[PDB]
Every structure is written in C-alpha cells, then in structure tokens.
Amino acid sequence: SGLENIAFNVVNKGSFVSADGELPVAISGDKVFVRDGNTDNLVFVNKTSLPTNIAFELFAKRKVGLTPPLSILKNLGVVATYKFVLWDYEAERPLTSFTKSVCGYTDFAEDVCTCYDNSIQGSYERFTLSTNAVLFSATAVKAGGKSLPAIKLNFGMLNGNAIATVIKNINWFVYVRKDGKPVDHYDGFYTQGRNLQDFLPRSTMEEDFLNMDMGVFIQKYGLEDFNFEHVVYGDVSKTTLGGLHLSISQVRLSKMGILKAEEFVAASDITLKCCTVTYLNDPSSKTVCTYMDLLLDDFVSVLKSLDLTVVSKVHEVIIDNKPWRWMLWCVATFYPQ
Amino acid sequence: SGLENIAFNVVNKGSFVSADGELPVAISGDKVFVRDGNTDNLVFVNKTSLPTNIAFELFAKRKVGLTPPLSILKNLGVVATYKFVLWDYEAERPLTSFTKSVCGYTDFAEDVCTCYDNSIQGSYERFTLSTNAVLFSATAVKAGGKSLPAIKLNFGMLNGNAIATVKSEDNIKNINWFVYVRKDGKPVDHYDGFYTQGRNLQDFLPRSTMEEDFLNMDMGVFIQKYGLEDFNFEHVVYGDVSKTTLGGLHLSISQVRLSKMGILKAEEFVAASDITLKCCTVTYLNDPSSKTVCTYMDLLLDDFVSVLKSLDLTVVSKVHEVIIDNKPWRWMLWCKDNAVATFYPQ
Amino acid sequence: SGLENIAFNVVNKGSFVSADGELPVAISGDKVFVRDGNTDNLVFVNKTSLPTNIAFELFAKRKVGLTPPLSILKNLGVVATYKFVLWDYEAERPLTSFTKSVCGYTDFAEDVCTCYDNSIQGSYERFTLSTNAVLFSATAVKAGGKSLPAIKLNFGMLNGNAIATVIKNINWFVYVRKDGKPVDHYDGFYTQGRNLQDFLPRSTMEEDFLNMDMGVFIQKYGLEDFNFEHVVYGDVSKTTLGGLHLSISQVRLSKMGILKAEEFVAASDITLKCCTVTYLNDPSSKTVCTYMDLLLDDFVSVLKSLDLTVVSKVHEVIIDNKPWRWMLWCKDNAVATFYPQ
Amino acid sequence: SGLENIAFNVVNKGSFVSADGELPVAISGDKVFVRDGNTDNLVFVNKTSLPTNIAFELFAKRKVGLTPPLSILKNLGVVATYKFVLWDYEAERPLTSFTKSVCGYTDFAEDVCTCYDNSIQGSYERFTLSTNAVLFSATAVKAGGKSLPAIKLNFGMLNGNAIATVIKNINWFVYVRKDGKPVDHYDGFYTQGRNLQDFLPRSTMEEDFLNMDMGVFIQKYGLEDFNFEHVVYGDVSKTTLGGLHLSISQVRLSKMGILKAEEFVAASDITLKCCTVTYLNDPSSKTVCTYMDLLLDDFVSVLKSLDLTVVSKVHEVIIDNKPWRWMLWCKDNAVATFYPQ
Amino acid sequence: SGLENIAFNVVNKGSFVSADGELPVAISGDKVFVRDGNTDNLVFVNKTSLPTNIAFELFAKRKVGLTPPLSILKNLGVVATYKFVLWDYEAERPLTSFTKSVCGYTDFAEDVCTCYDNSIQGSYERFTLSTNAVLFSATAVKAGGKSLPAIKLNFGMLNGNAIATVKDGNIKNINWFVYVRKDGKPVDHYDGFYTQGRNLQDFLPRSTMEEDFLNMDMGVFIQKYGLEDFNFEHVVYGDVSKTTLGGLHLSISQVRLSKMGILKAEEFVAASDITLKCCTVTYLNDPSSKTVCTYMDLLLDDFVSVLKSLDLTVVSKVHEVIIDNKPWRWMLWCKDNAVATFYPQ
Amino acid sequence: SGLENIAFNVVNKGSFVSADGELPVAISGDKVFVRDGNTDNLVFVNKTSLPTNIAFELFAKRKVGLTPPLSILKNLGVVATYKFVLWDYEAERPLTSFTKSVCGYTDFAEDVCTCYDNSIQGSYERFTLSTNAVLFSATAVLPAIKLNFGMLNGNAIATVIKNINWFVYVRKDGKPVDHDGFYTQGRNLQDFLPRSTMEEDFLNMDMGVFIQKYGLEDFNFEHVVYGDVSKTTLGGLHLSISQVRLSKMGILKAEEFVAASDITLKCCTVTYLNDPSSKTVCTYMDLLLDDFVSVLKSLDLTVVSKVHEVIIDNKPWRWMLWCKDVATFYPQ
C-alpha cells in the first residue's frame, strides 16, 4: 500500500506478503535504505534500467519459492505478467519491463502476450480468454479427464537456485495460445538452467561423466563413434581451446584446475550462453565460447539423430521451443551458431 | 499511505492535505516523477542533501500560505519543528534537518530546541513544558486583556514571497506574527532590536514612506527632507559608481534604487531566507564598478536611520553593536567633521 | 547512425538533419557533453525519466519549426509517434514514452493509438490502415475535393513558443480514427497554449481586456450580467483571491503589480492548469487555483450558453476534445461563481 | 586536516594516522578516486546514505584492528561515538550517524547517549560525567580497589573479522550509565558475531557438534530431553527445512551439500538475524529463517533452564542485553518445537 | 586544508583568497554543500564534465573581478593556464580543463600552449622563455617608454559581465593587452576586429552609432550614416514580414528586435569563448523563425567598416574578414551596386 | 562507427572486432544496458572516473587474450597508447587516461611517451620515430626485456608444453636504452600457481625440509617470509607466495588499500582468523621465489644496519636490512 509498506514486508518477510506496517525509506541513487533506529541499512541495490524505488517494488512483488525456468517464457514472447512478477536472479532484473495489476508504474493497458500463474485465482480463466498468452501450473490442467498438450518439466528454480527432481518431485506444465488458437507443437528439448559453481548432475549419465575417465565413460555409453577429443570434453593441449559447448563439460574441467568463464551478458532467461573461457594450468582459452546447459542424455540423443554420411551440414535442433543451428563435419567438430 | 499518497496530494492539492489517493512515482537521481497516462511528469527537483524522496515529503508537509520569517527562528537556535516543516524557498530546503512527528526518516527522539506552531493542536502545551523551545502564533498569546511580551512582527512570508501590512490606498491588510522563546525552563522577559524584512532584489516593495521617497526622490531632496546631512548617504547608503570600487550598498534597498538606473548584478555566495546578514559580489555595468565582498541586510530604511541617530559622531573610530533578528551584530564607525565617513557591518 | 552522429547534428544544425559527421560525446549523470577542442561543452540536460542518452536522441529527432498544440493529442490518447517525436518544451520531455520508427530503444512493435504527421511521406497511408490513430496536417485533407471533418486550429506552436494566425496564417487540421472508423463529430473550444510571461492577446476583446479600465470593458462588451469583477478579473482586496481562472486574468494582474504563479506540474500538453497564485502589493493568495487559457471570446461564448435563473448547475463544457465539469452558482439572475473542477 | 590529507593516509597507511601529506582526490557519485600518475585509482565505494566524501572520511577514522562486537553497542542505545567511529564491515557503514569530535560534518552537539573508548585518553572522565553513556575497554575498570560490574566478553572483531580468546587473549569490558547512575548488573547471553563461511568452533562442544553424528553427540552431552533432531539439526527430509535456528546448525548442513542463505538485511550489529535458506541437494527452503549465532554451550544452558512440564509457552530470553521471545511447544517430558519470533 | 578550506573561502570571501579556516563539506551528485549550523547550504552546482569537488575548486581558483575576453584566448590555441583558471560564466566551466600549478588533479606536465596572467609573479619570465604561449596584461609591455606590438582591447569582462571603456568627466578605462608567442618567437602583427562579450539581455551600446541604431527609426539611421548602398532592412535589421526571419547576424540586431516585441533565441551550445554564435531565433508578435541563425557581437562601427571595404560591382564573392584573430568567411552578393545578401559561413 | 555499434560487438564477439551492425543502448549512472527484446540486459558497470560511455568504449577496444604485464609499462612512464587500449582487470580501468587514434574523446594531440603494440602495423615505425616511447612484441626485434610470463584475458599466466614470451623496448630523449632487475609475476592470492619447482616445494613442504634443501639456514625464513602467527602482530608475509601458503593452513584475509594489476609494490591489511594476528600495513610483492632468493645471496651478512636498493620492474626499491651476523628484511 506504499513504498514504506513494501520496505516493511521485505525487511521482515523477505518479500511482499501484504502484511501491515511501515518503515522509513531512503532512496539514494541506485540504493534503497531502510532506517532502523539511528542508522540506515542498505536493503536493495538497483541492477536495472527502471527507477530504483520501482525496481525495488517489483523485486518485492516477485514470485517466491518454487518457480518455472525463465528461458522458455522469454522465447514464448511473454511481455507482461499478471498479478505477479518473475525475478531473474542472475541478471538481478524482472523478466519483463511490463506488468498487469502489480505495480501502478509498470502496469500496462493494451492487450499483449501475457503470462499467467495458475496458482492465482481467476488467472486460468483470463488465459483462455486471451488471444495471445501463456500459462504455467504446478499441476496439469484438465480438459477433460486426462491431460492437455503441454510442456512438461521435471526441474525448475528454488529462490533463484537451480533445482530439480530426486524423494522430491518438481513439476511444471506450460500452456501457450496464439491468435486465439491453442498449440500442440511442444517439442523437444529444454535447458536445465544450472550454473558453474552450484552445478549438480541430474542424471546417472551425468553422474558418470564427471567421475569416470574419458575412455571408460565413452566405452560404457557407446560414444566411441563420436569424437570427444575435441568437442564435449575440451583440450588444453592446444593454445586455442577445444570444445566446452556444454555447461557440464566446463564443470568437469574446473575439477582439473582453474577455469574462468566471463560471460558477455548474464541472465537466467538466456538459452544460449556466450562467454570467454580461460584455463590457467595449461593455458589455452576461447575468446568466443558458445555453450548451453543440456541434460547430457538429451544431448547424446541428438547425436543419435546424426550420421557419418555427410561431410558437413546445418542441423537445427529444437531447444526451449526455438530452432538452434548447429554446424557439423565428419564425426570431428560440432557446435552451435 | 506513504510516498505515492504524498505525490497524489502535491500533484493535485499542491501540498500534503491528507487527501486520499495514489499516483505511481518514479525516483531518478535528484528528480521526482509522477506517471500520468503514458508519460512521466517532473514534480520535484532535489536541492538538498537529503534523500530525494525524503526532501520531497518534507516539502509536501511544509507549512503553506502565510508563514513567519525564517531568520529569527534560525537566530533563536531552532533544531527541529513539531508536526510541520518550514520551507526556505530561497534555499530550496527545510529550515532544519530535524523533525518531531512529521516524517519517520527525519523524526528525532533526543531533546532539542524545538519550534512550535500555535495553529497546531497540542503545540502550546508541549512548548510551555519544554526546557528550551520557540513558539510562533498568528494571534497574540494573552493573559487576560494584556498581551504577554513577544517578538512582534508586522510582516512575514506568503508562499515564499515577502509580504507585509499595507493600506491598499484607494482597506487595511494586517500581517502579524508573534514569537515566544524559552531558555532553561523560563520565558524571556523582553525582546529588543530590529528585524530584517526578508525582501529580495527583484520583488522588492517599499514598506514605508521613507522607503518610497528613497527610490523616487533625487538624493538631495531626500536627504534634505529627512535631515540626513550628517550621515552622508551619498557614500554610506546610496553607493557610488563614480569610482571603480562601489560605495556602501549595505542595504537591500540600496541595490534596488541602483538597479533602476542601470544594470546591477548580485551573486550571493550562499542564498537562504534564514540568513539575516547576506554577502554577495555586486557588479554595475553601465559605469563599470564592483564590490567583491558586499555585506548587506534588509532593514526598514526607517530603522537604519533610527540607528544612525543613536550614534556619537564626535568619536574617531567606534565599533557599534546593533541587535538585529535577536542577535548582536558588529558595525564599524569612522567619523570626521562630526559626520559619517564609513558605516558598515562585519 | 549513432550518438556521435546525433551530437554533431545538434551542435551544428540544432536538430537531427541526418547530415553526416561525428563529435566525441561524454555522458555524465543527467548531462550530455560534446568535446570541442580541449574542453567539453554542455549540450543537453536531461529532465526526463528516460536514459540520459535516449532523452538526448529523442530531443534531437523532435519535430522542429512549426508544431501542433500538444494538449489535444494527449487527450486523443496518443501512445506513440511515427517517424518523429513531439517535444514538450515546458515539461522538457517528449509527448510520449513511445515511438515507431524513430529510436531503437523507444521503438514499440505492438498495436497502440499512434499520432501521424502528414508532412512526413508514407504517414497518411499508415494512418487509414490503423484501427486507432490520430493524424495532423498543415493543410486540409479532402476526399471528394470537399474537406473531411476535422479539428481546425488557427494557432499552434513555433519552436516551443505560442504563435497564432495574425500577413500570417497558421493552420492545423487534426483527424482521429477510433475502432476502425473515422469520427464525424468534433465540437468544443480549444486552449491557446500561451503562458503568463509571453502572453499576447489574440483578439480585439483580449486587447481591450488588458488595456481598458474594467467596467468600461464590462460595458462595451455587455457583460454586466456577468460577475467579471470576481469571476475573471480577480479580487486582491481580500486575503484570498478568487477569479483568475483564465491565463489572461493573471496576465492583466501581473501588469498591476507583482504576481507569482507556481504550477504543481508544468506541461504544454495539459488542458486544465493548477498553480498557487500570490499577489504581493495587496497581499492575496489562492492555494489551489485552476485555470485554462481560453480565448476570452470563447469564454464569453460559454457564459451566454448559461441559464442564469438557476441556483446551482454543474455544466459540462467541451475543451480540447474533453468534457470539463464546471460549477455555476447564480444570484439575482447573475453569476455568483463560475469555476472548473 | 582535509579530504586530500585523509586520502593520503588511507592510500598509504590503510586508515587515518594523522600523517602529513596530500593526494589529489576525485569524487564521482558513490566512488572516491586518487590520482596516481596519469590514472585514477578507486580507493572507496560508498555503501552508506551519507555523502560519499563523508563516508570515506568516517571509514578512515574508524577504529582499526582489534574492536568490540557491535551488537551489544547498537542494542545499548548508542547514538554518537567520541573521537572514533566504529565501522560495520558487513553493512559497510558506521555504527552511528553521529559523532563527537571526529568529523566536522557528522559532529553533533546536544547531549545524547555516547559511546566512549577507554584506550582514548580523557574518555573515562567524560564517561563518568555523562547522564547517559557507554564505555568499553580492553581491561577491567577498578574502583574502589577491587572491581566494577560489567559486561565481559571473551570474543571480538579484528579488522571486521570474528575472533575469540582461543595462545591469544581477547577481552572486552562494557559499561553503561542511565539517568546519571551506573548500571546495577548485567545479564543474559551474547552472540558470537561469526558468519557461515568463516565459522570456527569456539568450544569443545561446538567442535563435537560439527564432527559427530547425532545421538553420539546427543548421548555425550545428555540432551535427549531436548529434541535436537527437529529443533536444531535442520532435517531436509521434508519440503520445508526444519531447524537452522543457529549459525552452527547451518554450518554443519553446508558440509553435507549446497546451502544458500540470502539475508534480508546484512549487519554485524544485528543480534537476531533473518534470511531465506535454500538447500539444493534434497530441495527444501525456509522462506523466513530467523537465527542467531550463540555459543552452543550458551544455548544448551538456556534449554536446561526450561520447564518441560508445560504445553504452550513463550519464553523471554535475554541476549545482547535485550529480551527476545522464543516459543516452547514442548509436549511430554521433552521438547516438541523451540523457535524464536 | 584543501576542499574544506576552499569552501571556507568561497562561502565567506566569494573565491579562494588563501584565507585560513575550514567548513564541513558534503559532495552529493553534482552538488556541493557546506554545513552551517544544523543545515547544509548549497554553494555550488557542477555543469562541467569534471569531478564535482574538482570543478568546485577550479571555480574558487578562477580569476575574479576584471578579466580578459575568452574568445581570443581560445582562438590563440590556449590549452592550459598558469597559477589561475579563467571561468566561463556562461558555460559554467573553465576555459581549459588543464592547469599549471593550480590544482593537483588538473595539473599538467607536457609542453602545451599556456596562458599567463601578468599580475601573477613568475608569469612573464615563463612566457618569454616559452616556445609557445600567450600573455595578457592590464598594462602595456613597453621598452622603454614605447609599447611592443600587442592586441589592445578597450573592453573585457567583469565578474562574468561584459564591460567597456565608458564616459561630465566620468572616464572609466578598461584595457587589456595580449601577447602571443608561436614557434620560439613573438608574433609581430595583430590585425582584425574583436567581438565584445555582450548578451541579448544585458546588452549596452558602446558607440553613438549603436545608440542611434537602437533608438532611431531605420532609414533615419540609414540616412544619417549613409548606409543606403547596403541591405540593412535585410541582413542587419532583420525582417519579421515572412515565415523565415532573415538578417539578424549581429547580436545588436536581436537586441533591437527584442524591444519591438517578444524575441526568443536558443543557442545550440552556450559559451563566452565562442566567436561565432549559432542559435534558433523566434519572433512571436509577427510569427517568424530563423532555424539556424549564425551571428556575432561586433561593434556596429566595425561592421560598417567591413561593408565599406566591399566591392559592390561583383556578382558574388567570398570575403575573408579577421575577427578575434581568426579568418572568417563572409559570403557576398551584389544586385546593382548594392548588397543582396551578406552572411557568415 | 559509434556507441550502438560497439555494444553490438561487445554483446556478440566479446570485444570490438570492427564487425558491422548495431544494438539499442541505455546509459544510466555507471551502468550500460543493451535492449534485447522486452528487457534491458546489463553489459557494463563503470569503475573509472571517465564518462560511463567512454569507459565502455575503451573496454571494448582493449587488447584481448594474451597481454603483457602492466607493472613494467606503468613505471616506464607510458602516458598514451596507439590504436589499442590496455585494460587493468583488477582495477577495472584502462592503463592510461589517454590514447592515440582509439577514442575521439580520450584521443590526445600533443607529443607524449607512447606505448606501441608490434602486432599492429605502422607501430614499430612510429615507435622508432618517437622522441620518448615504448614498444612490446610477442617476438624479438637487440636489448630487450625478456618475460616468459604475461596476462591472459585478465588472468596471470606463464610458460610450462606451452611457451609464452614478451619483449619490451624503450626510447628516451631520442635514443634507445640499456636495461636491469627482476620482475613481478602478477599473480593473486586466490588463483596463485607455482611457476617454479622451488615454489612447488615451498607450498607443499614443511619449513625445515625446505630451508635445508635450498640451504637457506643463514637467513631465517621462519620470520622474514613464511610468516609467524605467534605474536599479536603477524610479521613476515612480504611475498605473495607466503600468503598463499598461510591461507592453506587456515583463514587468511587481505584487504588492499588500492587494487591494480599495474602496481609493483602491493600494500594491504592482513588477518589470520584461526590463531588471531594482524598486520595493519604489510607491503608485499609477487616475486618468483627463486628471484627473491637470488636477492638474498647478493647480501652482506656482516653489516648491522643496511639499506639495500633492488631493481624490480625497472625501478629502484629501498629494502631494509638488519643482521644477527639474517634478522630483518622488508621494503619501504
């Protein structure tokens, strides 16, 4: 019911819970202070292009706890969100510049592609009545009796941290509507949204990839055909650095010594990452390294779709519901863009 | 209801009236924006050392309309105000950095000299029970029929502009303020001295007959009329452009009369409505002349003259102490021929 | 082709002419500097909530020279502008937060109500294909060689200044299209966009209003039944002012003495203005003073549309294509008070 | 003697030592630069609500090296500090907005509650003449001839880092005065001031709690009545984290997997801390997790003070010289749930 | 005591006099505050690209009172300035951004063209020994009894305000003398005309011709000074009759037009160091606009002098007239033994 | 050809490659945003005193990948650089306030000491034509500065099979030079790697074994280098590698007064948490351990008090010496 109120909620509850109360608030440049006793504590720092007080409010009104991965929602063309805001924790910014019934400043009028949270009363109804829109739910929408064509997710984010199923089940179901018309498209591959430091294997294959030597691993999974000498492992034997087009391959290399990734831009909503990687111990490096995080199993399966029977070609493979062009030689070198 | 409510009030009522409503607010740098439709408007720019949003709130909670002159309140040592802020429109800041029961951020717990508005409920009580305090009132505090001793003002400020009692000619208009002081759990027995009129160079209007004649009459006629021959206004007051360094220009009114006959520029080192003794660089273009440090105050010409007649002109050098805005001020006197050579402050 | 190109244009031409060249540009806080020789010159100071470099660019790409009044277009609900931006010189910002084919950062892909300039090639066509749009032109738009229905204006803005037809002819024609269809009805009056300092009278009445002793004016123009000595002229003999609901009333007063006016928000796109007014010489004030800048002629027109036999009537009068609630009080078959909001 | 002097001190000696010299200084926004040769170096970034140059000065004049823990002082009502500032290396600001004889801008004179350093000459004398004051010292104050009641601490901070007596002896004695009279006695427990990453055991019980399985440990210290598993150890078994109401329990948990804690507000002067804890390996979050850092020995001797014969209870426990409420749900001859707030 | 000391000087004496004292100072954004009692007063606002505390100091170290015109100094290639700064009061920035022995932050090592004030000890020595440099003086350098070649100005600025030599007795003499050194030796020749410092608002006539120009109906003026062969009703006086304005290439043209009605002029970049001004002019009462209007402040006498030196036969020619020690291109068109257009650039 | 062009390059290629095309750019305070779709991503945060947009430009035009150590180049008096920019990744500012043919705003007309890159055409020529100047090359050219180490994308790197070298040449007052000390390796506490088998031993070996093996018994390491937590005041830690070994045994915290990659003699406040001690000032260097030892054996045992001058990164440094006849060694 005001900035001071928002501050109170955040200082105490960590987010905006609608709780009643107020704290004195100072806005200096990109910083937000709240006065406690005789001194001011800095509760927020603005990383966005929005007015600080506003960016603060949006962050307070963010969806808290378990949340859907942002990368897909970005690709789906989402513009405004309804009665809530998705926070990109890496980028330290909201997923959108636009909002519906959240913040008087960011609130938006004209009809536009809009994301709906199914845990919010009356959202789903508004979804079906929308020409263009997206909806996500913890549970599969029933019409009628079994399921709807959807996007199924065994993973997601918890308080901004990459999370996934293990006995805990994490599930997301995404639905899409274009030009008045629902869609059955929905395929085939999705990024796991894991970072370098906190990376944990989500599969038994990934469990093995980090531990086993290249030979025993390759032999085990029958990857002998595909050449990992260059790609998917990476080679410091050369001054210019081979492979590392998977988030997971970098993780293995950082176990063998000091690996530094500096991304050009950083966001959790980006499907295809681009960084500059440097390996210190045997000093190779890659000025432009294009990578993305895939469940290794999902990646191998996309290798199965290939052949040694062409010299070169573009395969576009479908990830986060976009075409992504990968370039190939023969198997010798493989990589996106 | 907070910032967005304050914004609503200011945009609509011009100040904070405790009206109900909200406008979305943006804070960028020193600027306060309200969003009306598809565009943002600029309602405030921060001239203070406070957080932009706080300065804005303090400004909205400022006393509006008729207000007392700020200089006397400063000279009385007011640290904080109770349930109001006084805005210095010259300085574009509050009279104080501290408040009681106004803003959560600037509210101050510790015991200080506090100013009280007698127009506000509960103030007189807090004041008479206060060890050190100041109180101002638009009507005289009276123990029956007989007025308690006070600082008595026939002038004041209106929305940041200097006003005063006037006849209206072709019908009176009375501006009055009354100011009461408490030091060490006791009232003060008497108030004396002179008060500065708070006028500025552009908007200056004469508040007396003498001040009217000063701006109109040629120097001879004026001096002749008021019997001023011994004080030699020709230097001390009027100011002299004949030389390359300016004459006195020690009164606000001196600069006004001079700016009628040519181009006069005055740059103040610091500008505030609460400063009783002001300092500027003065420049007169038409007959180029300058004063790098020009110390002036705005005094009713009648009061300044009054002071002169209190002077012993037989003396060679003398340092006179003159009470203005309830403070002692130091003024240098040099005489010859039993007439004034120089009379200036500091 | 960039910030440096734009700076070159502004510093030289005073606007973006698409002319070729570059100057070194420094952005510090809300200030924009061009480096000339060994020193940096201050060019733009940013009064907007937009990024300092964007506000500069939009200011550079603003329509220069003669421009249409901003008030109406704001009321017509314009979200965006096509191949140009309109500058509000009072507000020191654009009329809109959005543009179409102007600036990459502010360019908006979706469907919103858009203002179109006819002088700009390609615009009229896009105007008629738009579901909701506005368009303005310096010349009438004819279908059958006979003019289309339009908002017709004898005045406007020149380089952020208020000018009028006066041998000098200034004309604007405004056309709206809402919900797939044009609009056949424009009724109302319009605000002249003048301000207190630069105010010039645009009629014979106005000239007379300013020069003539009131009551001679009251007589010659036959307003006796009207309250003007209160409702218009304004009354300084009381601690509270009254009247001053027209710009021109303040203008006549500022001539009589020292009149100060602080607007709560300043914009050239605002129809109904609000400010605190103060008069020093016979001290008087109005804390909330709502005012217009209507042609005095247009105001008198409204006064004669009134039923003076009433007690309290709230009239809705059309100004700048919007209804505006006005409170009338009558006494002895004369106006007691007439004011807005 | 001036901003440029202060910068000379900081760039060379790390703090303000009163050394003579000057360096050219640039204040841009929240940043402070010194010019060394042809380039500017960034000395300081301003995290405070204070003007950048003032925060830089206060940071320079901060008490350096061995310092008292800030939580007690904050809680004790401390307003101004006298001839020193205390820096909070977490919050990156001073313990106070006000000072006495330190910085001309922050220097404030009207009597208030003032903290005094005994290593600073003249202070004790000023402490005893103060109506409301606080004194701290590295050595006990005697009189007459024996001792004085005090808050005694075996731990402190060193250059913003948590340290305890461990062959090194670390001691602080804090004294208080209200209403012209000394403070009769001091009670309660004290937070250790440690943090999740830099945590070190201050006691043998703490060492064991970290290195031992439950029930080897619980058996050894005979805590069986108090139910530790759900109340302390922070079982991740469920979707909502349990336990984690002590720093040390969050430390033991971060050994077994990835534990994230986002604090709403960071300060080293804060007694009762509140964050959002996340555990990735077997996912669980406590959206609001209120915790303290208490010597585990001090926590247990709190538990033994409890009455386990009651069902619903609110216990008031004194920590850092303030009462704090904990809820005791204990059911039968044991503890069901014990948590603060 | 640096910043706090400088502040004490500005708040009290108006500039830095090397008085002793300290005031607590707060730098917030582009603003400089001093604490007086319980409140901060705002003493400075930074319009420069320099750090705020630095621009405050350079301003305090500005030359105060009577100062030389900054246009010539800029044109002469001045880069740094020795033991003083010159403040441009219009642009609210220094003339330089580089200093020699002024401010530790702004101070410069490498050899560059430097300006010297002759009232400052050590200055003339360094100037005569400089390979490139400029000197200015309130008094002529003379040897002996006879004055070396210089730039003689009877006008100048006073506290940022344009003043000039002026006259009931009443002579106030304003004089500046400028000396240049390029490539290890003096320049022997100074020619051309000089712009005054005047602005539209504070403008004052410096000659009888200018007084008459302002007070006289055109053609009474034109008759009196015999200007008929020149276009003055256009190309000087300026013409509100059409949509595009025209004329107004002199500061004094705008001034005269400014007293006949409402005239607005908005400069593209404002400075006191600029010889050739460029703005956008608008006349409200008879609506007219010159979108790009280039003009100068020239003694009307000096301009009339340029006109009479023109060849009135030739159809079109580019003229070069030297103003503020730089060549400026003026375009000429002659109709029949008379001016058609005469304009800068 | 502009800011929007630069942004395009940076977001895509990581630096300015001259590639064509543009992206929408927002400048707020010290932050630089590029608009991508419906959101603005934050590309750059300005740590310099330069205009935000300029600093961003200089960062983009920086030399990328393999670079020379800046310590030397600072000391040689380098003022402007020619058609390139050297970035200090620790200070997050460039090496100079000036440039020659790089950025229109930072570009400088007057003649000054100028560093040249020899992988840039027309450089060596302009270098030899220059009154005072500096040149660095990936290959030799003659008297030089031989460096088997350097920086890679802002990381301290060096030779081990991977060979990396740098050659530096100087001119002063219209003539070449003859140059000649040791050089700092530019490593940092966290990312430290031993570049010499001796250092490899220093970290991994207990003290006595180390001192006996390399025969350092005379001058006691247990004080001067290894560092000693015993006293309330730390002591030792005048080397980078000395702090790296201490951080192995517990919690070590250093706070530098000023952080730069171009700095030779480092300074900072050091603290050991596990067995508390602090050094308030602690000036220190990163020297190849072998090269520091070679300094010790140029020393006189027989003097009670001696002030030694040593050349590190082409600069004289005052080192303090007392002997037990061996006792105390440390700078400034």
From Swiss-Prot, chain E:
Organism in which the protein naturally occurs: Human coronavirus 229E (HCoV-229E)
Function field: Plays a role in viral transcription/replication and prevents the simultaneous activation of host cell dsRNA sensors, such as MDA5/IFIH1, OAS, and PKR. Acts by degrading the 5'-polyuridines generated during replication of the poly(A) region of viral genomic and subgenomic RNAs. Catalyzes a two-step reaction in which a 2'3'-cyclic phosphate (2'3'-cP) is first generated by 2'-O transesterification, which is then hydrolyzed to a 3'-phosphate (3'-P). If not degraded, poly(U) RNA would hybridize with poly(A) RNA tails and activate host dsRNA sensors.
Cofactor note: Likely affects Nsp15 binding to RNA.
Protein name as it appears in the record: Uridylate-specific endoribonuclease
Active site: 234, 249, 290
Occurrences of domain Nsp15 N-terminal oligomerization (ranges): 2-62
Coiled coil feature spans: none
Stretches assigned to the AV-Nsp11N/CoV-Nsp15M domain: 63-187
Start and end residues of each NendoU domain: 204-344
Requisite cofactors: Mn(2+)
Subcellular location field: Host cytoplasm, Host perinuclear region
Catalysed reaction, written as an equation: uridylyl-uridylyl-ribonucleotide-RNA = a 3'-end uridylyl-2',3'-cyclophospho-uridine-RNA + a 5'-end dephospho-ribonucleoside-RNA
Taxonomic superkingdom: Viruses
Curated annotation (Swiss-Prot), chain F:
Domain NendoU: from-to ranges: 193-331
Domain Nsp15 N-terminal oligomerization: 2-62
Active-site feature positions: 223, 238, 279
Catalysed reactions, as listed in the record: uridylyl-uridylyl-ribonucleotide-RNA = a 3'-end uridylyl-2',3'-cyclophospho-uridine-RNA + a 5'-end dephospho-ribonucleoside-RNA
CC cofactor note: Likely affects Nsp15 binding to RNA.
Cofactor(s) this protein cannot do without: Mn(2+)
Subcellular location: Host cytoplasm, Host perinuclear region
Domain AV-Nsp11N/CoV-Nsp15M, chain residue ranges per copy: 63-177
Function in brief: Plays a role in viral transcription/replication and prevents the simultaneous activation of host cell dsRNA sensors, such as MDA5/IFIH1, OAS, and PKR. Acts by degrading the 5'-polyuridines generated during replication of the poly(A) region of viral genomic and subgenomic RNAs. Catalyzes a two-step reaction in which a 2'3'-cyclic phosphate (2'3'-cP) is first generated by 2'-O transesterification, which is then hydrolyzed to a 3'-phosphate (3'-P). If not degraded, poly(U) RNA would hybridize with poly(A) RNA tails and activate host dsRNA sensors.
Protein name: Uridylate-specific endoribonuclease
Organism: Human coronavirus 229E
Gene from which the chain derives: rep
Shown part of the complete sequence: 6111 to 6456 of 6758
